[PDB]
Write a protein that binds this ligand. Structure first.
Ligand SMILES: *[C@@H]1O[C@H](CO)[C@@H](O[C@@H]2O[C@H](CO)[C@@H](O[C@@H]3O[C@H](CO)[C@@H](O)[C@H](O[C@H]4O[C@H](CO)[C@@H](O)[C@H](O)[C@@H]4O)[C@@H]3O)[C@H](O)[C@H]2NC(C)=O)[C@H](O)[C@H]1NC(C)=O
Ligand SMILES: *[C@@H]1O[C@H](CO)[C@@H](O[C@@H]2O[C@H](CO)[C@@H](O[C@@H]3O[C@H](CO)[C@@H](O)[C@H](O[C@H]4O[C@H](CO)[C@@H](O)[C@H](O)[C@@H]4O)[C@@H]3O)[C@H](O)[C@H]2NC(C)=O)[C@H](O)[C@H]1NC(C)=O
Ligand SMILES: *[C@@H]1O[C@H](CO)[C@@H](O[C@@H]2O[C@H](CO)[C@@H](O[C@@H]3O[C@H](CO)[C@@H](O)[C@H](O[C@H]4O[C@H](CO)[C@@H](O)[C@H](O)[C@@H]4O)[C@@H]3O)[C@H](O)[C@H]2NC(C)=O)[C@H](O)[C@H]1NC(C)=O
Ligand SMILES: *[C@@H]1O[C@H](CO)[C@@H](O)[C@H](O)[C@H]1NC(C)=O
Ligand SMILES: *[C@@H]1O[C@H](CO)[C@@H](O)[C@H](O)[C@H]1NC(C)=O
Ligand SMILES: *[C@@H]1O[C@H](CO)[C@@H](O)[C@H](O)[C@H]1NC(C)=O
Ligand SMILES: *[C@H]1O[C@H](CO)[C@@H](O)[C@H](O)[C@@H]1O
Ligand SMILES: *[C@H]1O[C@H](CO)[C@@H](O)[C@H](O)[C@@H]1O
Ligand SMILES: *[C@H]1O[C@H](CO)[C@@H](O)[C@H](O)[C@@H]1O
Ligand SMILES: *[C@H]1O[C@H](CO)[C@@H](O)[C@H](O)[C@@H]1O
Ligand SMILES: *[C@H]1O[C@H](CO)[C@@H](O)[C@H](O)[C@@H]1O
Ligand SMILES: *[C@H]1O[C@H](CO)[C@@H](O)[C@H](O)[C@@H]1O
Ligand SMILES: *[C@H]1O[C@H](CO)[C@@H](O)[C@H](O)[C@@H]1O
Ligand SMILES: *[C@H]1O[C@H](CO)[C@@H](O)[C@H](O)[C@@H]1O
Ligand SMILES: [Ca+2]
Ligand SMILES: [Ca+2]
Ligand SMILES: [Ca+2]
Ligand SMILES: [Ca+2]
Ligand SMILES: [Ca+2]
Ligand SMILES: [Ca+2]
Ligand SMILES: [Ca+2]
Ligand SMILES: [Ca+2]
Ligand SMILES: [Ca+2]
Ligand SMILES: [Ca+2]
Ligand SMILES: [Ca+2]
Ligand SMILES: [Ca+2]
Ligand SMILES: [Ca+2]
Ligand SMILES: [Ca+2]
Ligand SMILES: [Ca+2]
Ligand SMILES: [Ca+2]
Ligand SMILES: [Ca+2]
Ligand SMILES: [Ca+2]
Ligand SMILES: [Ca+2]
Ligand SMILES: [Ca+2]
Ligand SMILES: [Ca+2]
Lengths: 438, 443
């Protein structure tokens, strides 16, 4: 005789399921303990649903033996009905009408899924930002989403779909308010582009379930009155090295980006390693003060560089480099770098002598070597003939003896600029040229 | 049983209204034709609005019968929302649910009115201009105006309210960019005024929205213009300077000449002078000091001089090579060193129609050193003094009469005239007492 009731484990169960879920979705399982004798009618339990709130339609089904609740429809919608309440019944004696019974409450809440795409509150946006500004928000767009707040199905994830080729802008999302903020991350240039059109899009963090919203934003760049710019950063001018003192020339030129004019700009010299020219403060033109020299040792590549400081009346500054190309003038004769030559009597018959002209090639080789300025006594026992455009060979004539001589070699360039250089020639008894102690 | 849908005349209407318009403003009218039996329920049409974008608030209401759209609020703002799109529906059978229906779109654009006053983006401006410069822009001010670009509700219309009394400055508005441009149109002088403060103002071409009650809430801005100093050359102020010098000065006596100064320094150092014009050549200029030195004796009564003032023009120059010209007026203070004189040496008196001639004397010196003159026949023989009388008719006009009976012919009468202080002069006159009639026939 079962003189005992079967009681549900929980007075009020609570389960959770997702909306739009497949039918047959296991919601949860109830169980009941029976103090009576195991494994006989007296403890064989049966489970059922007795009430549902809201009542219709029927959306939940109980299994008679196991006590498992399941959905019967996909018509679960969090945005319409978030919670259902059930009263359940367990009856012993295999569920026969004369079986003992208990009741219990059973809560079912519907959790959210991302089935609403987020949408911009406006179709188009417009903002205006100053040029040469960076790391600032210039616009805030706000979005609509019908899903559950403060969840991955709700909060937005913005992107710039088109228009951000140069990477000037960045869009990010505020966690505090879920609106998107458009930020400038590279400065803009009104003289390059006065207006920039972008297209933004928005999705949630969570992927869509079961056509993304878009909006165009035109950003108008504002012109600010800027100072002088030294473009190009490197300018060059030509000037004859034999230019007369007082002769002027265009110097560095800087212009205003707005006006595109050079007026009002005052110049000033920074670096100058030679100090041949001066700058007119008002015009920026340069005037020769001391004679130029393309072949000077302070010069390299025959180019003479000074740095200049441009400034407008507003007080903003700009620095450039003026390269003064010194046009060559044939004002240097060739010369022989190595003044001492060693000739071996039993293994050599001549030496190689090379010359150099500081001027540019047009005003240098081919060189003509001669012994014109020489005594009658060396010109009988010394020959030279050019082996190429810059070098010649000095051979010994008429059986000369061992000893240190002195040979005056005259070298002249293509245009007749002449130079004589006395060489200390030694005709010792060398063999490898590295053993000549004479 | 009518079996016809009502189709809108236009698939997508388009209307326009002004922002801030009264409620009940007619926006436009939609219509639909029903290709069906006329004048029974089977064709009596009903119109409605089914959607509005943006949705809230409801801003337009349709008339069920006429199809006229009207505004329901004055809260239409072009600067917030410029365009609305709504979907409309027309249904036959008098709008009963079993009535046939079609839909159509209706775009509504908001037109602009001037309800934002333009305002300077800065409250105060400062600029710097070079002196003795003109016809150049010295400042560009920009304004904020939220109204519709390139319209009379937007573009600015500038004025200099105060500070521009001498008319040095001019403001105009740039057509391309709507910023105001401040131009200098009369040159400035750093030595008079180093700084000039003015106040500018701005309005639109169009007046502020009609029912406005702000009086003048017009935007204004102060502009400080700092004049820049130029290193200028010598100034000949006054352009005419004057100096006094005794007419009887000894040769070699010096005196201050023309004086020019630097506008910045107010000093005369470094300035070298040079003579330009001098019609007489009595004085010379010291190139370094500008002082003048007498080279030949002066003469107030010389004919190259007029009004007893002896003028040379001078060229002042500073060490830089820039110039300045002035006029030095040398006052020759008179010294009584001249006796009276006879203007005309031959008088023709008619014996049968006149009894005397008029003889006037002239003293080159100043009035104080001249009349009244005393005429006399002192140096004359006893022989003319019997047949010639003279008495002054006034202080300088005098008369020569014949009292005895002389014969017709040319004589010589020496009239000695002396001045107020006794400088005397004797002058022989060829007086002819021929038998003339009108003074014009005596040979
Ligand atoms: C004023 O400015 C001008 C222009 O910049 C400058 O003229 C240049 O000088 C450089 C040397 O500093 C030259 O560059 C060389 O070119 C040759 C051939 O192209 C190369 O063989 C060189 O290579 C060596 O040096 C390099 C230096 O960067 C190294 O990187 C490299 O590893 C090698 O060691 C070098 O590139 C250049 O040709 C000239 N330009 C002209 C037009 O002649 C001039 O020197 C400046 N004035 C002064 C007084 O400095
Ligand atoms: C006209 O004739 C003269 C006389 O022959 C000639 O002068 C010679 O030019 C050569 C260049 O080919 C010079 O050779 C150099 O010698 C030194 C040591 O002596 C070396 O360090 C040099 O560089 C070496 O480095 C290279 C990089 O690895 C090696 O691969 C290479 O083998 C080089 O050897 C170079 O050898 C020679 O010294 C001069 N002679 C004299 C006396 O100065 C000149 O070139 C001719 N002119 C023309 C236009 O042909
Ligand atoms: C050297 O410079 C000085 C001044 O720098 C100059 O002295 C002036 O010369 C002018 C010559 O035109 C004189 O002008 C005359 O002044 C007398 C006295 O007041 C007047 O009666 C004269 O009247 C005539 O001209 C008038 C002109 O408007 C007519 O309206 C009138 O009807 C008469 O025709 C005439 O104005 C002047 O008086 C002097 N003195 C001054 C200005 O103090 C001097 O003449 C220069 N040297 C030489 C050689 O001229
Ligand atoms: C936002 O979307 C981009 C691609 O659309 C993705 O790479 C990124 O991880 C997303 N951010 C978050 C926080 O989910
Ligand atoms: C400029 O201002 C004046 C005075 O305020 C006004 O009458 C005029 O209409 C404005 N616009 C033009 C184009 O002149
Ligand atoms: C003095 O005499 C002359 C003679 O012509 C006359 O012109 C002048 O008016 C007279 N009166 C005077 C100077 O008061
Ligand atoms: C079982 O429990 C409640 C009381 O807790 C009863 O009122 C009801 O019959 C339920 O089914
Ligand atoms: C759950 O709650 C209901 C009331 O809402 C009770 O009647 C039931 O017995 C269980 O305690
Ligand atoms: C103008 O700009 C340069 C930097 O390029 C500075 O060196 C100068 O002081 C002024 O700021
Ligand atoms: C002149 O000076 C600036 C620094 O003041 C440099 O950065 C520039 O490149 C120019 O050489
Ligand atoms: C009118 O009505 C229907 C419902 O909005 C639309 O599908 C149709 O394209 C037109 O807009
Ligand atoms: C007018 O509006 C839209 C176009 O923007 C249409 O899709 C709609 O059906 C109505 O005809
Ligand atoms: C003096 O002379 C200079 C020229 O040397 C002029 O420029 C100036 O106007 C004044 O006449
Ligand atoms: C010297 O020259 C000036 C012009 O610079 C004249 O104004 C002046 O009258 C004098 O002749
Ligand atoms: Ca039991
Ligand atoms: Ca849903
Ligand atoms: Ca959802
Ligand atoms: Ca969502
Ligand atoms: Ca720029
Ligand atoms: Ca700019
Ligand atoms: Ca500008
Ligand atoms: Ca500028
Ligand atoms: Ca040289
Ligand atoms: Ca050279
Ligand atoms: Ca040469
Ligand atoms: Ca019909
Ligand atoms: Ca407005
Ligand atoms: Ca306005
Ligand atoms: Ca407006
Ligand atoms: Ca001045
Ligand atoms: Ca000055
Ligand atoms: Ca000066
Ligand atoms: Ca005199
Ligand atoms: Ca006198
Ligand atoms: Ca006198």
């Amino acid at each position: 005789e079962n003189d005992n009731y079967p009681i549900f484990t929980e007075e009020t169960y609570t389960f959770t399921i997702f909306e739009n879920c497949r039918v047959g979705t296991t919601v949860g399982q109830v169980c009941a303990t029976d103090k009576d004798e195991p494994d006989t009618m007296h403890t064989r339990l049966k489970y059922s649903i007795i009430g549902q709130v809201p009542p219709s339609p029927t959306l939940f089904s109980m299994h008679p033996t196991t006590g498992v609740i399941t959905t019967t429809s996909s018509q679960l919608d969090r945005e319409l009905i978030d919670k259902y309440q059930l009263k359940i019944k367990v009856q012993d004696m295999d569920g026969q009408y004369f079986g003992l019974q208990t009741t219990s409450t059973c809560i079912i809440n519907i959790d959210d899924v991302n089935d609403h795409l987020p949408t911009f509150t406006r179709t188009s946006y417009v903002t205006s930002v100053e040029e040469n500004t960076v790391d600032v928000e210039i616009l805030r767009v706000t979005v609509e989403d019908k899903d559950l707040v403060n969840t991955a199905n709700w909060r937005a994830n913005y992107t710039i779909l088109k228009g951000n080729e140069n990477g000037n802008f960045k869009i990010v999302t505020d966690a505090k308010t879920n609106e998107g903020v458009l930020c400038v991350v590279k400065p803009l240039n009104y003289e390059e582009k006065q207006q920039m059109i972008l297209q933004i899009g928005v999705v949630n963090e969570a992927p869509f379930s079961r056509a993304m919203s878009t909006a165009t934003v035109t950003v108008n760049v504002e012109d600010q009155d800027e100072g002088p710019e030294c473009n190009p950063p490197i300018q060059t001018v030509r000037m004859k090295e034999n230019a007369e003192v007082g002769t002027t020339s265009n110097g560095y030129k800087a212009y205003d980006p707005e006006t595109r004019s050079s007026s009002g700009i005052r110049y000033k010299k920074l670096t100058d390693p030679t100090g041949w020219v001066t700058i007119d403060e008002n015009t920026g033109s340069i005037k020769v003060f001391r004679s130029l020299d393309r072949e000077a040792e302070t010069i390299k590549n025959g180019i003479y560089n000074i740095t200049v400081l441009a400034s407008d009346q507003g007080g903003r500054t700009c620095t450039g480099t003026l390269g003064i190309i010194l046009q060559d003038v044939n004002d240097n004769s060739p010369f022989i770098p190595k003044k001492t030559v060693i000739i071996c009597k039993p293994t050599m018959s001549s030496a190689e002598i090379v010359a150099v002209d500081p001027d540019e090639p047009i005003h240098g080789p081919p060189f003509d070597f001669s012994l014109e300025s020489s005594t009658s006594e060396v010109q009988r026992m010394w020959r030279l003939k050019a082996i190429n455009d810059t070098a010649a060979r000095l051979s010994y004539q008429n059986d000369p003896p061992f000893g240190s001589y002195v040979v005056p070699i005259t070298v002249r360039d293509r245009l007749g600029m002449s130079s004589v250089t006395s060489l200390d020639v030694t005709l010792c008894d060398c063999i490898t040229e590295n053993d000549c102690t004479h």
